[PDB]
Design a binder for this molecule. Structure first.
Ligand SMILES: C=CC[C@@H]1/C=C(\C)C[C@H](C)C[C@H](OC)[C@H]2O[C@@](O)(C(=O)C(=O)N3CCCC[C@H]3C(=O)O[C@H](/C(C)=C/[C@@H]3CC[C@@H](O)[C@H](OC)C3)[C@H](C)[C@@H](O)CC1=O)[C@H](C)C[C@@H]2OC
Length: 185
Protein backbone atom coordinates (compact mmCIF):
# COMPACT_ATOMS: atom_id res chain seq x y z
CA UNK A 1 0.00 0.00 0.00
CA UNK A 2 2.86 2.37 0.86
CA UNK A 3 5.26 0.98 -1.75
CA UNK A 4 5.30 1.25 -5.47
CA UNK A 5 7.03 -0.70 -8.28
CA UNK A 6 8.11 1.33 -11.31
CA UNK A 7 9.16 -0.12 -14.67
CA UNK A 8 12.14 1.62 -16.25
CA UNK A 9 12.52 1.19 -20.00
CA UNK A 10 15.72 2.43 -21.71
CA UNK A 11 15.16 1.04 -25.23
CA UNK A 12 17.09 -2.18 -24.52
CA UNK A 13 15.33 -3.80 -21.62
CA UNK A 14 12.96 -3.24 -18.73
CA UNK A 15 14.21 -3.19 -15.13
CA UNK A 16 11.85 -2.64 -12.17
CA UNK A 17 12.49 -0.54 -9.04
CA UNK A 18 10.38 -0.81 -5.91
CA UNK A 19 10.45 2.18 -3.53
CA UNK A 20 8.32 3.79 -0.87
CA UNK A 21 5.92 6.39 -2.31
CA UNK A 22 7.73 9.03 -0.17
CA UNK A 23 11.27 8.06 -1.22
CA UNK A 24 12.83 10.58 -3.57
CA UNK A 25 13.17 9.32 -7.13
CA UNK A 26 16.89 10.06 -6.75
CA UNK A 27 17.16 6.50 -5.25
CA UNK A 28 15.73 4.95 -8.41
CA UNK A 29 17.96 7.09 -10.67
CA UNK A 30 21.09 6.34 -8.75
CA UNK A 31 20.32 2.61 -8.68
CA UNK A 32 19.68 2.61 -12.38
CA UNK A 33 22.76 4.68 -13.20
CA UNK A 34 24.99 2.49 -11.07
CA UNK A 35 23.99 -0.54 -13.15
CA UNK A 36 25.03 1.26 -16.36
CA UNK A 37 20.92 10.51 -17.70
CA UNK A 38 17.38 11.82 -18.30
CA UNK A 39 14.30 10.11 -16.86
CA UNK A 40 10.82 10.93 -18.18
CA UNK A 41 7.38 10.15 -16.79
CA UNK A 42 4.42 10.82 -19.08
CA UNK A 43 6.86 12.93 -21.13
CA UNK A 44 7.94 15.19 -18.25
CA UNK A 45 11.46 15.27 -16.85
CA UNK A 46 11.75 13.68 -13.37
CA UNK A 47 13.72 15.69 -10.88
CA UNK A 48 15.74 13.73 -8.32
CA UNK A 49 14.08 15.43 -5.35
CA UNK A 50 10.56 14.44 -6.49
CA UNK A 51 8.72 11.48 -4.99
CA UNK A 52 6.24 9.06 -6.54
CA UNK A 53 3.57 10.66 -4.37
CA UNK A 54 4.42 14.13 -5.81
CA UNK A 55 3.87 12.78 -9.34
CA UNK A 56 0.75 10.69 -8.61
CA UNK A 57 2.45 7.51 -9.80
CA UNK A 58 0.72 4.15 -9.65
CA UNK A 59 2.12 0.63 -9.38
CA UNK A 60 3.90 -0.50 -12.53
CA UNK A 61 3.83 2.89 -14.23
CA UNK A 62 6.59 3.22 -16.84
CA UNK A 63 9.53 5.64 -16.68
CA UNK A 64 11.61 6.21 -19.80
CA UNK A 65 15.35 6.29 -19.13
CA UNK A 66 17.23 8.24 -21.80
CA UNK A 67 20.84 7.22 -21.90
CA UNK A 68 21.47 8.82 -25.28
CA UNK A 69 23.34 12.04 -26.06
CA UNK A 70 21.90 15.30 -24.87
CA UNK A 71 19.82 16.54 -27.78
CA UNK A 72 18.35 13.16 -28.52
CA UNK A 73 18.91 10.32 -30.90
CA UNK A 74 17.39 8.70 -33.91
CA UNK A 75 16.80 5.08 -34.89
CA UNK A 76 17.99 4.54 -38.47
CA UNK A 77 16.48 1.76 -40.62
CA UNK A 78 18.84 0.87 -43.46
CA UNK A 79 18.18 -0.75 -46.86
CA UNK A 80 18.79 -4.21 -45.33
CA UNK A 81 16.24 -3.69 -42.56
CA UNK A 82 18.94 -3.27 -39.90
CA UNK A 83 18.05 -0.68 -37.24
CA UNK A 84 20.69 1.23 -35.33
CA UNK A 85 20.71 4.07 -32.81
CA UNK A 86 23.82 6.01 -31.78
CA UNK A 87 23.37 6.51 -28.05
CA UNK A 88 26.91 8.02 -27.76
CA UNK A 89 28.91 9.25 -30.78
CA UNK A 90 32.48 8.87 -29.55
CA UNK A 91 35.35 10.44 -31.54
CA UNK A 92 37.97 9.17 -33.99
CA UNK A 93 38.31 7.61 -37.45
CA UNK A 94 35.19 5.60 -38.28
CA UNK A 95 35.40 1.81 -38.17
CA UNK A 96 35.89 0.41 -41.70
CA UNK A 97 35.87 -3.08 -43.17
CA UNK A 98 39.21 -4.78 -42.58
CA UNK A 99 39.91 -3.11 -39.26
CA UNK A 100 39.96 -5.32 -36.20
CA UNK A 101 37.64 -3.80 -33.64
CA UNK A 102 37.38 -4.46 -29.91
CA UNK A 103 34.00 -4.02 -28.25
CA UNK A 104 31.89 -4.68 -25.20
CA UNK A 105 28.39 -5.86 -25.96
CA UNK A 106 25.14 -6.95 -24.35
CA UNK A 107 22.31 -8.74 -26.17
CA UNK A 108 18.58 -9.07 -25.43
CA UNK A 109 15.64 -10.94 -26.90
CA UNK A 110 12.18 -9.56 -27.76
CA UNK A 111 10.86 -11.29 -24.58
CA UNK A 112 13.23 -8.97 -22.59
CA UNK A 113 15.74 -11.63 -21.48
CA UNK A 114 19.45 -10.77 -21.57
CA UNK A 115 21.15 -13.63 -23.50
CA UNK A 116 24.80 -12.52 -23.29
CA UNK A 117 27.18 -9.80 -22.21
CA UNK A 118 30.92 -9.52 -22.65
CA UNK A 119 30.91 -7.51 -19.36
CA UNK A 120 29.74 -10.75 -17.56
CA UNK A 121 33.02 -12.52 -18.50
CA UNK A 122 34.84 -9.19 -18.09
CA UNK A 123 36.27 -9.93 -21.51
CA UNK A 124 36.33 -7.55 -24.54
CA UNK A 125 35.28 -9.12 -27.85
CA UNK A 126 37.45 -8.50 -30.93
CA UNK A 127 36.83 -9.36 -34.58
CA UNK A 128 37.78 -8.41 -38.12
CA UNK A 129 35.01 -6.08 -39.34
CA UNK A 130 33.51 -6.97 -42.71
CA UNK A 131 34.93 -10.50 -42.70
CA UNK A 132 31.83 -12.61 -42.18
CA UNK A 133 33.16 -13.52 -38.68
CA UNK A 134 29.92 -12.32 -37.07
CA UNK A 135 26.27 -12.16 -38.03
CA UNK A 136 25.38 -9.88 -40.93
CA UNK A 137 23.80 -7.24 -38.69
CA UNK A 138 27.11 -6.76 -36.85
CA UNK A 139 29.23 -6.56 -40.01
CA UNK A 140 26.89 -3.84 -41.29
CA UNK A 141 26.08 -2.18 -37.97
CA UNK A 142 29.52 -1.75 -36.42
CA UNK A 143 30.82 -0.04 -39.55
CA UNK A 144 30.85 3.71 -38.95
CA UNK A 145 31.27 3.53 -35.17
CA UNK A 146 33.98 5.54 -33.43
CA UNK A 147 35.97 4.83 -30.31
CA UNK A 148 33.91 5.60 -27.20
CA UNK A 149 30.76 5.19 -29.25
CA UNK A 150 27.75 3.22 -27.99
CA UNK A 151 25.43 1.98 -30.73
CA UNK A 152 22.24 -0.08 -30.27
CA UNK A 153 21.55 -2.54 -33.12
CA UNK A 154 18.06 -3.98 -33.59
CA UNK A 155 18.81 -6.90 -35.88
CA UNK A 156 16.01 -8.58 -37.84
CA UNK A 157 16.27 -12.39 -38.08
CA UNK A 158 17.63 -12.40 -41.64
CA UNK A 159 20.61 -10.42 -40.41
CA UNK A 160 20.97 -12.69 -37.33
CA UNK A 161 20.32 -16.41 -37.08
CA UNK A 162 17.15 -16.73 -39.13
CA UNK A 163 15.10 -19.84 -38.57
CA UNK A 164 18.03 -21.63 -36.92
CA UNK A 165 18.63 -19.54 -33.84
CA UNK A 166 21.82 -19.88 -31.79
CA UNK A 167 23.31 -20.33 -28.37
CA UNK A 168 20.37 -22.45 -27.17
CA UNK A 169 18.32 -19.48 -26.01
CA UNK A 170 18.03 -17.48 -29.26
CA UNK A 171 14.98 -19.11 -30.81
CA UNK A 172 14.09 -19.41 -34.45
CA UNK A 173 13.04 -16.21 -36.18
CA UNK A 174 14.32 -13.91 -33.45
CA UNK A 175 14.95 -10.18 -33.61
CA UNK A 176 18.03 -9.34 -31.53
CA UNK A 177 18.91 -6.16 -29.67
CA UNK A 178 22.61 -5.51 -29.00
CA UNK A 179 24.28 -2.58 -27.36
CA UNK A 180 27.83 -2.32 -28.72
CA UNK A 181 30.52 -0.09 -27.14
CA UNK A 182 33.57 0.43 -29.38
CA UNK A 183 36.67 0.27 -27.20
CA UNK A 184 39.47 0.17 -29.77
CA UNK A 185 40.35 -0.32 -33.40
C1 LIG B 1 34.87 -21.24 -33.55
C2 LIG B 1 33.76 -20.87 -32.96
C3 LIG B 1 33.75 -20.23 -31.61
C4 LIG B 1 33.58 -18.69 -31.68
C5 LIG B 1 33.23 -18.07 -30.34
C6 LIG B 1 33.71 -16.90 -29.86
C7 LIG B 1 34.74 -16.10 -30.60
C8 LIG B 1 33.25 -16.37 -28.53
C9 LIG B 1 32.25 -15.22 -28.74
C10 LIG B 1 32.34 -14.19 -27.63
C11 LIG B 1 30.84 -15.78 -28.95
C12 LIG B 1 30.03 -15.99 -27.67
O1 LIG B 1 30.64 -17.04 -26.90
C13 LIG B 1 30.43 -16.77 -25.51
C14 LIG B 1 28.56 -16.34 -27.93
O2 LIG B 1 27.98 -15.14 -28.44
C15 LIG B 1 26.53 -15.16 -28.46
O3 LIG B 1 26.02 -15.33 -27.12
C16 LIG B 1 26.22 -13.74 -28.98
O4 LIG B 1 25.96 -12.83 -28.21
C17 LIG B 1 26.22 -13.42 -30.41
O5 LIG B 1 25.17 -13.62 -31.03
N1 LIG B 1 27.30 -12.88 -30.98
C18 LIG B 1 28.58 -12.63 -30.27
C19 LIG B 1 29.04 -11.19 -30.46
C20 LIG B 1 29.08 -10.85 -31.93
C21 LIG B 1 27.69 -11.02 -32.54
C22 LIG B 1 27.22 -12.46 -32.38
C23 LIG B 1 27.94 -13.33 -33.34
O6 LIG B 1 27.98 -13.09 -34.53
O7 LIG B 1 28.64 -14.45 -32.82
C24 LIG B 1 29.34 -15.23 -33.81
C25 LIG B 1 28.48 -16.38 -34.19
C26 LIG B 1 27.88 -17.22 -33.09
C27 LIG B 1 28.31 -16.62 -35.51
C28 LIG B 1 27.47 -17.76 -36.06
C29 LIG B 1 28.41 -18.86 -36.53
C30 LIG B 1 27.68 -19.95 -37.28
C31 LIG B 1 26.83 -19.44 -38.43
O8 LIG B 1 26.09 -20.55 -38.97
C32 LIG B 1 25.90 -18.34 -37.98
O9 LIG B 1 25.23 -17.84 -39.15
C33 LIG B 1 24.07 -17.04 -38.87
C34 LIG B 1 26.69 -17.25 -37.28
C35 LIG B 1 30.65 -15.69 -33.19
C36 LIG B 1 31.46 -14.52 -32.64
C37 LIG B 1 31.44 -16.57 -34.15
O10 LIG B 1 31.80 -15.78 -35.30
C38 LIG B 1 32.73 -17.11 -33.54
C39 LIG B 1 32.48 -18.27 -32.60
O11 LIG B 1 31.38 -18.82 -32.57
C40 LIG B 1 26.01 -16.28 -29.36
C41 LIG B 1 24.49 -16.41 -29.32
C42 LIG B 1 26.70 -17.61 -28.96
C43 LIG B 1 28.22 -17.46 -28.90
O12 LIG B 1 28.77 -18.68 -28.40
C44 LIG B 1 29.21 -19.59 -29.43
Amino acid sequence: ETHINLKVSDGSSEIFFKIKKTTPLRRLMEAFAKRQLRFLYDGIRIQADQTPEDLDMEDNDIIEAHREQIGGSTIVTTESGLKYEDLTEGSGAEARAGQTVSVHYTGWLTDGQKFDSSKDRNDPFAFVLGGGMVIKGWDEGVQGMKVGGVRRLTIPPQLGYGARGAGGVIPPNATLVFEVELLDV
